[PDB]
Write an enzyme that holds these catalytic residues in place. Sequence first.
Site, short mmCIF file in Angstrom:
data_model
loop_
_atom_site.label_atom_id
_atom_site.label_comp_id
_atom_site.label_asym_id
_atom_site.label_seq_id
_atom_site.Cartn_x
_atom_site.Cartn_y
_atom_site.Cartn_z
N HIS A 63 0.92 -1.37 -0.36
CA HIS A 63 -0.03 -0.03 -0.30
C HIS A 63 0.72 1.12 0.34
CE1 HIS A 63 0.46 -1.11 4.49
NE2 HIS A 63 0.44 -0.15 4.52
N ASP A 93 0.37 -7.88 1.33
CA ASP A 93 0.49 -6.73 1.22
C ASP A 93 2.55 -7.35 1.49
OD1 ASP A 93 0.96 -3.78 2.05
OD2 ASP A 93 -0.69 -4.22 3.33
N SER A 152 4.49 2.14 8.14
CA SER A 152 3.73 1.22 7.17
C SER A 152 5.04 0.25 6.42
CB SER A 152 2.88 1.23 5.63
OG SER A 152 1.53 2.10 6.93
N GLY A 153 5.40 -0.17 5.94
CA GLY A 153 6.65 -0.75 5.63
C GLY A 153 7.53 -1.37 7.08
#
Lengths: 235, 54, 277
Positions: free
Chosen positions: A42, A88, A185-186
Site C-alpha cells: 500500500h 501486503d 507502514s513497511g
Amino acid sequence: IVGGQECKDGECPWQALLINEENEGFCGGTILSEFYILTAAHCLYQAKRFKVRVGDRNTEQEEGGEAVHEVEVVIKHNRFTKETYDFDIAVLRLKTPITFRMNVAPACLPERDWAESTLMTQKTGIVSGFGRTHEKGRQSTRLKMLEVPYVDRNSCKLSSSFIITQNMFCAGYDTKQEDACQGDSGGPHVTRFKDTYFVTGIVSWGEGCARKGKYGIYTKVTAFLKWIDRSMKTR
Amino acid sequence: RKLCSLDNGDCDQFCHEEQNSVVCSCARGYTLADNGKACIPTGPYPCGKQTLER
Amino acid sequence: DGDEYFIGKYKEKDETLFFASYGLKRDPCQIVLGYKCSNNQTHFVLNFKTNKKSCISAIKLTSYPKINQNSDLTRNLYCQTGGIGTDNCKLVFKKRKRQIAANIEIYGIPAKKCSFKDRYIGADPLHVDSYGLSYQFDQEHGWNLERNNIFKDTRFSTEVFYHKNGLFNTQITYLAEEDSFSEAREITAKDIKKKFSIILPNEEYKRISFLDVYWFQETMRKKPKYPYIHYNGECSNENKTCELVFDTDELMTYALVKVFTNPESDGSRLKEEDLGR
Ligand SMILES: *[C@@H]1O[C@H](CO)[C@@H](O[C@@H]2O[C@H](CO)[C@@H](O[C@@H]3O[C@H](CO)[C@@H](O)[C@H](O)[C@@H]3O)[C@H](O)[C@H]2NC(C)=O)[C@H](O)[C@H]1NC(C)=O
Ligand SMILES: *[C@@H]1O[C@H](CO)[C@@H](O)[C@H](O)[C@H]1NC(C)=O
C-alpha cells in the site's frame, strides 16, 4: 511507536527510508541485499514518485553518512486486494550497489522450517521505526525501537471483529501503551536467537493505536520465501 | 540430538535433518567449521550480527 | 458588478470601523487616516490597528472589473498577524493583471460583551451546519459523506481540512442518523495559549458521539500549517469527564465546538478502508 526507548547507535542498521519529492519519509524498508528493498504494497499508491534514503539517524537534519538512491523497478504480488489487506508484500530493485559501512548492514533471510519450528515459538520480538507519538499527534524525528510478545491463535482471532487471513498474524499488549501507530507502514519486525537477528514479519495493519484489548496485525513472511526466492533473480 | 528442534540441533545457524541425521548449514558469509557448531565468517561484513567498530 | 471576497459573517447591528476606496496601480499608496500599506506587481498588503475598545466582526472586499474566474477554489484574502476577535490584523490580497480598484470596509462590536455564538450556531443545528450546506447521508450505512464543492486540503492519507470564508473545519469521526444536539461551547481570545485543553461531560445520556471544530487563525504564507487536535487518552464509558487537548503551531483567535450526543455509541466507529496504518 508509543513509549519504548530510542534505538542506540549500532543496534538498528537494517532500516531504510522512502522519501517523496519534498524529501520527507512516509514508509520504511528492509535492506535484504545490495539492490533489494522490502516494502508494503500500500506504500506504492500514495506517492507518484519516490527515492530511497539510507544511513540517517535524524530525519530532521543531515548528520553525515546518509545516501540517496533512485528506484529502478517494483514488483508486487498478483493477489493483492485493497479490501482484506491481503498479500501486503512488495519488492524493489534499485540501481546503485549500496556501499556497506557501519550502521548499514543487511539482515539475512532465514529458512521457513526453522522459523516455524523455533523462531516463531520464541517469546518476544523487536520492532522499530519513526512512528507517531500519539493517536493523532506528531511524528518523531528520532528512530525508535520497541519490544512486543506473541499472542495465541484463539485469542488472536477472538480479539478483532474483522477477518484474519492465514498469511498474517497478530501481536501486541492488552492495555499498556506499547504499540506502533500509523506512519510505520513497511517497517521490519525481527527476532533474536542467540544474539542473531532474523526478519520475520512486516508491520501490516491494525485499527487504532494502543486501543484497549486490541492487537496489531503483521504480515507473515515465512510463507512467502519461495516467492521471495523467485524475486532474487528478477532484473 | 534426534531433531534440530532442540537448541537448533546444536548449530549456531541453519539446521535440518538429512538422512534422519542432524546436520548444520550456514548462511552467506559463513561456512561450517571442524566441530560444526559455529560457522566462521568469510566476509568483511557478514550478516546476522550488529556492527561494532568504535 | 465586480467580484467579492468575505471574512466572517455580517450582522445587522454593527458599526463601521472604517470604509475606504483604493487604486491598485499607484506607487506608493495614498496614506489614508495615517495607515500603512505596500503594493507590488502581485501583492497588496495593509496594516490596521484600532484605538477604541472593540472586537472586529467581519471584513469584505469588492473588486472591479469582473474577471473570468471563480472565487471559492483558492485563497485570495488573508491577514497574517491577528484575525477575528483581536483588535488588529494585517490584510494581504493577491492581484491579477486586470484588477484596478478596490473597496474595503470593516465592522466591529463593543469589546467587553462581544461573543459570536449567536450567528454560527444557526437556527436549526440538527440539519444545517455553520457553512450553510445541509447534511446528507448514505442510506445503507448512515454515515455522512464529504462535501466536495469547497477548498479542501490534506496533510497525509485519511485526513481532511476544509476552508470557506476564512473559516476552517475538521470532523473528528462519522455521524449517524439518530444523533441529537446537546449544546455548544465557545472559547474567546483571552484563554488561548500555545497548548491548552477543555473539559466536557459524559454522564449517562450525554455520551459524546461527534465533535466538529470551527476556528480562525493566521498563516505566514499561502500554505497553512494545520494544528494537531488529538483526543487525549481514550474517552470510554468509565471516565466520566473527557478532555480535548489542542497542539498548535500558530496562534488562533477563536474556536467553537458542537458536541453531538448518542446513547447507542460504543466509542468506536471507523470505515472499512481507514483502519490499517
Ligand atoms: C511585494 O511586497 C510583498 C509584501 O508587501 C512581498 O511579499 C513578502 O516579501 C517579504 C520579503 O521577502 C517576505 O518576508 C520574508 O519571509 C521569510 C519567510 O521565512 C522571512 O525569513 C523574512 O521575514 C523575509 O522578509 C514575505 O513572506 C512576503 N509575503 C508576505 C509579506 O505576505 C513580495 O515579495 C514583494 N514582491 C517582490 C517581487 O519582491
Ligand atoms: C479516561 O480514563 C483515564 C483513567 O485513568 C484517564 O486518565 C483519562 O484522562 C480519561 N480520558 C478522557 C478523555 O476522559
